[PDB]
Amino acid sequence: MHHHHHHEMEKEFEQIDKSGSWAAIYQDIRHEASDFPCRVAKLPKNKNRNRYRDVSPFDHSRIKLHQEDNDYINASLIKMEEAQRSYILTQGPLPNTCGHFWEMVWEQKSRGVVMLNRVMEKGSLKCAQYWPQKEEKEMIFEDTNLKLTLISEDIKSYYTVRQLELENLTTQETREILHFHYTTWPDFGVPESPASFLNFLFKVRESGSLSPEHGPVVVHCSAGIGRSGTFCLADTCLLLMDKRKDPSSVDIKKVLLEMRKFRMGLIQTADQLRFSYLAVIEGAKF
Ligand SMILES: NC(=O)[C@H](Cc1ccc(C2=CC(=O)NS2(=O)=O)cc1)NC(=O)[C@H](Cc1ccccc1)NC(=O)Cc1ccc(C2=CC(=O)NS2(=O)=O)cc1
Numbered sequence: 510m511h512h513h514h515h516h517e518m519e520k521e522f523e524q525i526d527k528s529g530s531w532a533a534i535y536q537d538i539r540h541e542a543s544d545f546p547c548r549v550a551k552l553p554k555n556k557n558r559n560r561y562r563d564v565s566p567f568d569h570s571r572i573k574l575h576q577e578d579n580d581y582i583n584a585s586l587i588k589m590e591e592a593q594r595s596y597i598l599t600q601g602p603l604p605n606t607c608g609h610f611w612e613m614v615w616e617q618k619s620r621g622v623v624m625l626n627r628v629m630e631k632g633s634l635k636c637a638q639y640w641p642q643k644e645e646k647e648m649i650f651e652d653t654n655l656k657l658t659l660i661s662e663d664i665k666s667y668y669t670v671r672q673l674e675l676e677n678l679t680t681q682e683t684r685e686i687l688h689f690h691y692t693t694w695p696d697f698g699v700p701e702s703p704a705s706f707l708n709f710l711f712k713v714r715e716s717g718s719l720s721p722e723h724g725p726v727v728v729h730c731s732a733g734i735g736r737s738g739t740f741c742l743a744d745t746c747l748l749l750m751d752k753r754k755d756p757s758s759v760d761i762k763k764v765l766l767e768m769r770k771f772r773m774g775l776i777q778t779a780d781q782l783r784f785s786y787l788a789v790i791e792g793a794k795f
């Protein structure tokens with residue numbers, strides 16, 4: 510990628526931004542977004558497994574738990590072919606689905622978990638605390654054979670990184686799970702700056718949590734679509750620029766619509782779309 514690519518990219522952002530065109534672009538994405546059945550998510554017995562009735566995983570891409578009783582979890586597999594990366598986007602676990610959440614992490618062989626929301630937002634519980642606190646580092650999930658222990662916790666200004674140990678109580682196998690928690694990303698909003706977001710994304714990448722040597726990273730916010738979608742779109746577009754002969758050929762609208770074939774509503778505001786674009790052009794420099 511040469512300087513002319515950077516030039517066109519930056520000029521384009523400026524042109525879109527100065528004319529406030531994000532609004533129209535975002536509307537077109539919403540208007541063209543695909544729709545597929547969500548029959549399983551809507552089954553009566555799955556009512557208490559969904560945080561929002563208007564946010565469901567499509568049947569074709571939903572993540573199935575390996576258990577036979579009820580394999581449903583509100584989670585979707587976002588598989589980006591050209592970029593060669595898979596992500597699992599899920600809702601913030603409910604108190605009764607924290608076990609399911611870790612069963613998914615175990616079954617999919619994930620190494621990292623990216624959390625982009627806070628436990629309480631706008632006065633209500635938007636995500637059950639599914640990881641241990643300092644005073645009780647050990648957790649055992651009801652109706653599961655999984656134990657979770659907090660090994661380390663590093664609290665920074667805009668995010669916190671944790672090392673966790675997940676253990677299968679039946680086989681005694683233990684695995685290191687990295688928790689990347691962005692603690693200052695407002696609901697329906699954007700990160701404080703492209704720099705903070707990029708530092709976070711790069712930290713996730715450097716850990717190996719996004720490598721094909723491990724299962725798909727699990728990403729979530731409250732509904733698993735707005736902030737989670739922004740995070741994944743930026744990472745994927747960055748991947749495409751590093752792989753393509755001509756990085757300026759990346760079509761952000763096309764890429765987002767492709768991701769939306771896997772999970773509904775990815776990116777919830779025009780400003781989040783704008784931020785994704787900004788994060789990509791800023792990250793392209795690195
Ligand atoms: N759309 C939204 O803002 C959020 C989801 C939403 C939340 C957050 C975000 C995020 C922004 C972000 O930046 N990141 S993010 O976390 O992804 C995006 C979307 N959805 C809602 O608030 C909807 C009510 C609604 C429906 C349609 C349109 C508007 C409101 N509320 C519910 O679904 C609660 C509810 C769930 C099940 C039932 C039930 C029906 C039933 O039949 N039985 S029941 O279980 O009681 C009844 C109520």
Ligand SMILES: CCCCCCCCO[C@@H]1O[C@H](CO)[C@@H](O)[C@H](O)[C@H]1O
Pocket residue numbers: 517518520521524746756757758759760761785786789790
């Ligand atoms: C997510 C980041 C996507 C970056 C895609 C940038 C595509 C640049 O596109 C180019 O921008 C130039 C400057 O306006 C125009 O003159 C060119 O005709 C146009 O093809």
